[model samples]
Target chain A: ADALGMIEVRGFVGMVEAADAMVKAAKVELIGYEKTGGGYVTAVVRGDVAAVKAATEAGQRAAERVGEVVAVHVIPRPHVNVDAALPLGRTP
Target chain B: LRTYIFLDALQPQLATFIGKTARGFLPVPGQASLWVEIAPGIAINRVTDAALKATKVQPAVQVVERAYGLLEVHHFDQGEVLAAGSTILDKLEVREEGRLKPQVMTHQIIRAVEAYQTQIINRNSQGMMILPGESLFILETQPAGYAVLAANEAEKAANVHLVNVTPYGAFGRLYLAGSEAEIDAAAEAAEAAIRSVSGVA
Candidate 1:
C-alpha cells in the first residue's frame, strides 16, 4: 500500500529542497506543492507506509537546514477516495 | 524642495526597479532603486520616468494605481540613488477602492495594515506594491544589508516612525512614516546613505 508524506516550510526554496530530499531519502515520489502567501509553502510526496515515514523524517531534517520547517506528517494506507482526489495521485 | 524618504515605504521595492519578487519572478542582479509617487489619475505614467532619469540612474517601473489616485515609479542605478516621483497633474478616474470609497475595482490594494487617521500616500504592500495611502516607503535591497543602512540613516537624520526594517531574503524592505516635511528631510539622509559604497558593500 502507498503512503503520503508532507512537509511545510517557511518559504519557496525550502519547499523545493525538502521535496527533493524526501524522494531521495527513500522510495518516494514528490507529487505536489502548495503555497499560502507570505512565503509559506508545503511539499508533498507518496510512497509505501514505511517509506513515507522515513521520507518525511529525511525531508524534515533536510528542510531544517535551509529554511524553517512548518510541519511534517505521514499518512499510511490513506483512503482510496483521498488518494484519488489529493495530490497523492489518482487511485485506480 | 520637499523630498521625503519613505519612513514606512510604499513597498519601495515597487519603488525599486529590478529584483526578484518573493515569488522570484523579477531578478535584478545589481540594480538599486528608489520610488516616487503622485496623486493618481491619467496621463502621468511617463512623467515620473523623466524625473528618474534626471537623477542620472536608469529610470523604470512606472505604476499608475487608478482607484486610489496614486502614481509611482522606480529609478535604478548601478551607482546612483535619487528621489523619483511623478511630475504630472493628470485627471483621475474614480472607480472606488478605498476604505473611504466603496465600489467596484479589480486592482485595488487588498492587504491589511496599521490604519492611521490621516490619509497615507501608499497603504497596501505586497511584493513591493505601491499603496494608495502610504506616506513613507519600503525598500527591497539585493544584499538585504542595504535596507538596514537606508532605514538607519533615515532615522538618524530626521524624526519619522520606523515601521519596518527587515534585512533578509537578500532583499530588504524598510518602512518609514511621518509628516511630509519630516519624510523629506529623512529621505535626503537616506539617499545620501544609498549613494556611498557602504550602501552596497
Candidate 2:
C-alpha cells in the first residue's frame, strides 16, 4: 500500500463564528484545537489527501464570507515512516 | 383625466379596487399589456397573469403618450425595481429517476470496460499477464475417447503459458517456469507493486 498525506491548517476568526462555519463545511475529524487572544480559535484536522484539501478551502471561504481577513498554511507530510517493530513487540 | 395614487402597495389592495373576487387574474389573449405610472420613477405594466397577477413598475416618473402593462408593486427603499418585459418566469416539468434506459445502459458498459482494464493493469504489475487467445483443456483421466481441444489454436503461436492458481490451506503446489530470484522478488512485493498501478495513487 502507498503512504497517505497529512494536512495542517492555521488561521484566525472573529469569536469562533468563522471557525464554526469551517468545521461544519469541511466535516473532518478534529485532532486538536487552541484559543488565542482576542477570541481567535485555531484548529488541527487530519484526513485523506482530498478531504484535507477540501477542509482548508472551506476554512478560507468561511473567513472571507464574514469580511474577515485570514491567512492559511498547509503542510503535506507524505510517505511517513511507520514503525513496524513496535507493533510486532520486537522493540521495547 | 385625474391622476390617482394607491396607498396600500399589497396585491390584495389592488385586487379589491379592480373588483376581481378570484384569488388571481388570468391575462386575456392580447389584453395582457397595460401600463400605469404608480409613483415617481415607478410604472405598472401587464402581461399574462395566469394563476397570478403579472405587473411591471417603473419609479422614474415621466409622463408619456400612454403606458400599457401589469402592475409590479414593491416596498420602499428595498432596491431598484426591474422594468416591464425584463423578467420571465415559466413552469417546467420535473421528473424522478429512471428517465432514459438506453443512456443508462451505455454508461454501465463504459464503466465495466474501464474496470476490466484496471484489473489487467493490477495483474500485470504483479508479474502476471493474461494474453489474448488463451485456451481451456480437458483432463487425461476422462473416458477412453473423450478429450477437449483448446479454445484457440493461436494461443500456442502467441507463446501463451499457464500458471497454477491455488488458495491458502489447499493441498497443492503452484509452479511457474521463471528464474528463482525474479519469482522471489515478486512474491515479496506483490501487494505493493499491484497497488502502485492504481491511477488514483
Candidate 3:
C-alpha cells in the first residue's frame, strides 16, 4: 500500500496565515504541512485508507471555513520500493 | 547544458591565446592543464577541430580536466616546444579572437526550449477545449489525481463541487456537483494520463 498522501487548500488571506491555520487544524495526526508558492497549502496525512480519508475530510472542512481557502486538493499515498542487499557469496 | 573545452598543457603557447579569448581562465601549476570557458556563442568543437587540423605534431591527446563545463587537453612532454613557438602563438591568439565574440546563439536556444513547451500546452489545450459536453475528455490529466482526492475530502465535509481538474493533474470540478463514482473515474483517468505522459507508471 502507498504511504504518502497530499491535500492542497487555497483562498487563504495570505500565505503565512493560511499555512498556520492548516498546521493548527492538522493537529498531531498530520505528518507534515507546508505552503507551496502563492497562497497554496499542502498537508500530508498518514494512516490506513479509511483513517486517511476521515482525517483529510476534517482538514478540508477546516480549510474551507477559513476565509482564504478557495479550494482543496487531495491525493492518494504513493508506494515506495525498498532495496535489499544480496546475500554474500551468492553469484550467478 | 554546460560545456567543457580541453586544451593540451604541452601547448603552453595556447594558454596565452586562451586567456585572451576565454570568459575566464584557471591554471593549476605542476598539473600541466589550463581550464577555460569559451565566451558565449563560441563552438568549442569547431575550435578544437581547427586546432587539431592546424597542428603538424602527432600523438596529441585530449584529457578531461572536468566534464561538461570543464575540460583539459594535454600533450605529454610537449609544453616546451609550444613555449618556443612565437609565430604559432600569434596565430592561435588571432584565431581565438575571431571565435570568442559573443553571439545571440544562447538566447536562440532558450527561445527554442520555451517554444517547445508552449507548443505542447497549446496543443493539449486545443484538444481539451473541443471535447463534447457529454464526452469526458481528460482535461487536468496531470493534476486531477491530487485534486480529486482533495475534492473528495472537501465534499465529505461541505457542499464542495468538483469542477474541472487543472493541467498539473490536480483534481478540480466545475462546481463540485459530480457523483463520487464520476469524480473517481475522472481522477483515475487523469492519473493514467499523467503517468502515460511522464512515462513513470
Against the true two-chain complex, what DockQ does each candidate achieve? 0.01, 0.03, 0.06
Global lDDT of each model? 0.48, 0.27, 0.33
Model 3, A1-92: lDDT tens per residue? Answer: 32233456664343334344444544324545565677666655544444455555665565555545544544343312210131111112
lDDT of 2: 0.27
Tell me the tens digit of each residue's lDDT in model 3 across B102-199.
11111001111244544443454311221122212222222222222222233333222233322111122211222333334333433432232221
Q: Give stretches of model 2 more than 4 Å off.
A: A1-12, A34-41, A67-70, A73-92, B1-113, B126-201
* lDDT string, candidate 1, A1-86, tens digits: 47778899988888887887676445577878877787788888877665667668767976888898988988877888887676
Q: Residue B105 of model 2: what lDDT?
A: 9
What's the best-to-worst order under DockQ?
3, 2, 1
Better of 1 and 2 by DockQ: 2
Q: Score residue B188 of candidate 3 by CA lDDT.
A: 47
Worst 10 contiguous positions by lDDT, candidate 2 chain B: B142-151
- TM-score of chain A taken by itself, candidate 3: 0.52
